């Protein structure tokens, strides 16, 4: 028989399997982009809907 | 590759260096149509000023 989910019944349980990152995930460099705004404002095609 | 470039606007600088490198390294021909220029025809004694 398959194990009853712990939240399904009213007993407390103090040994449980927590998933974890192996190390801090904010450690890396932040993303950065190269925005390059349009050559001529009058030439911009805002149409097409 | 014989690449034609009608625009240059919005192009990443990194992509431009990559293309010029493709000229130097993969023998790309790269026709940029947007450019306008005056020219001078120097004599060999004169050199490239």
> E strands of chain B, at which residues?
2-5, 29-32
C-alpha torsion sign, points B20, B22, B23, B28: negative
CA distance B24 to B48: 22
Q: Are strands B2-5 and B29-32 parallel, antiparallel or unpaired?
A: parallel
Give which of B10, B15, B3, B13 is closest to A43, Cα–Cα: B10
Query: Cβ contacts (< 8 Å) between A38 and chain B: which residues?
Result: 9-10
**Phi-psi map region of B34: left, alpha, beta (phi>0 left; psi -120 to 50 alpha):** alpha
Task: Compute and round to an integer the Cα radius of gyration of chain A.
Answer: 27
**Resolution of this entry in Å?**
3.0
Name the residue with tokens 């190269």. A34
Integer CA distances (angstroms), B37 to A46, B10, B41, in order: 31, 21, 13
Q: How many CB pairs under 8 A join A and B?
A: 10
CA distance A46 to B9: 17
């Amino acid at each position: 028989q398959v194990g009853i989910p712990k939240l399904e019944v009213d007993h407390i349980s103090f040994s449980n399997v927590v998933s974890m990152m192996t190390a801090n995930i904010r450690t890396g460099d932040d993303m950065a982009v190269e925005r390059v705004n349009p050559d001529d404002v009058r030439a911009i095609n805002i149409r097409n809907a | 590759v014989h690449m034609t470039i009608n625009e240059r606007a919005g192009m990443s600088k990194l992509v431009a260096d990559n293309i010029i490198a493709s000229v130097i390294k993969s023998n790309w021909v790269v026709d940029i149509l947007d450019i306008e220029y005056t020219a001078e025809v120097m004599t060999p004694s004169e050199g490239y000023t």
